[PDB]
Design a protein around this ligand. Sequence first.
Ligand code: HEM
Length: 154
Amino acid sequence: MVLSEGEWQLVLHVWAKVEADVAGHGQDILIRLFKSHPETLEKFDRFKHLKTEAEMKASEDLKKHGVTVLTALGAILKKKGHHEAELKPLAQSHATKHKIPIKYLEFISEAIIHVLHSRHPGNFGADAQGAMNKALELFRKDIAAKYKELGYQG
Ligand code: HEM
């Protein structure tokens, strides 16, 4: 898979909007993921005690982790597909430490797209969506490759 320059520009255009409230987005994205796919919460020792949306929104630590996740993702997308060095420490931790199947990266991808629509009603069109989808798909495929490289079936 390869994106056009056009597609990458739309991805980065949308990302600047995320970077205006990273905490806000990172918080909503984690919560969306936890709500839609509750089995993902169980992977988080620090958070799995959070039963409901209202509890999740009042956790400062969940908000902080959202910043962590979006910071790393942002550094990756900014590379426009030349992201191998950024991917390695990430593939390493999520494969060997955290034990996250690739299927869960598809779920958080869907969460990101949803939050982007919720947070940017008039901004985020069919085209930007198509671009973000391809960018996230690229990330998922290349991280799946790095899992296999480390000996893991993602
Ligand atoms: C765009 C997707 C993702 C990015 C960029 C990302 C990034 C990160 C980063 C930077 C960390 C902290 C350092 C590390 O442990 O590697 C982290 C920790 C973690 N990630 Fe992810 N992650 C992603 C998706 C997921 C998903 C889908 C799950 C589980 C369903 C997951 C589970 C975890 C866990 C359990 C930790 C350790 C959290 C802690 O207790 O501090 N990640 N992730």
